[PDB]
Amino acid sequence: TNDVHLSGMSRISQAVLPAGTGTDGYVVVDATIVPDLLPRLGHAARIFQRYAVETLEFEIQPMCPANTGGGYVAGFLPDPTDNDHTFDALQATRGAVVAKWWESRTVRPQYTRTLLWTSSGKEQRLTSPGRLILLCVGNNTDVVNVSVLCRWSVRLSVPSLETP
């Protein structure tokens, strides 16, 4: 059948937060989940027209010394159009996490499994499952290298050969 099931785990974001610039509410990461953001899924969506996100998980992997103060709040807004970047908006989303800067965590988001479009278009809601937003909570004492990883699983349909 045209449907092929792919899974993988890749880094959606890499950010560096210097010491003291991580004020409360600062936006460390704001990544709109698109197939191009994921390498293997990037090629897979380059050879397909439609994709549906069966499973989606995120892993916040901040690489900082244990003596680092402050923390982060990480969430997955299931609306690509939504631009709210406050603590309450993230915490309202299912699976959002709050953790110290030296404590890696996992986000298990909730979203609607609809058949999306691999290629971009006018309406972003038909192409992306949502956005991942990672904000600072409090103040960080050291420099934090944050890697945001995404464990994904998709179903691909309508074969084609697209261009970026």
What is the rounded distance in angstroms from the CA atom of residue 18 to the CA atom of residue 84?
24
Contacted by 35, from a second copy, Ca ion, none: CB < 5 to 8 Å by type: none
**Is 103 labelled as part of a ligand binding site?**
no
The yes or no reply on residue 78 touching a second copy (CB under 8 A) is yes
Provide the minimum distance between the beta carbon of 120 and a second copy in the complex, in angstroms, as a whole number. 8
Q: Which two tokens stand for residue 74?
A: 């990480």
**The CA-based dihedral angle spanning residues 152, 158, 161, 162, taken in that order and rounded to the nearest 10 degrees:** -70
Site for Ca ion in 100-139 (CB under 5 A): 119
* Residue 95 makes contact with a second copy by CB under 8 A: yes
The CA distance from 89 to 70, in Å, is 20
Residues 125-164 that bind a second copy (CB under 8 A): 125-126, 137-139, 141-143, 145, 147, 149, 157-163
CA 29 to each of CA 13, 34, 61, 124, 134: distance values in angstroms, whole numbers, following the listed order = 7, 15, 12, 19, 5
Query: Per CB under 8 A, does 17 bind a second copy?
Result: no
Residue 126 binds what, of Ca ion, a second copy, none (CB under 5 to 8 Å, by partner type)? a second copy
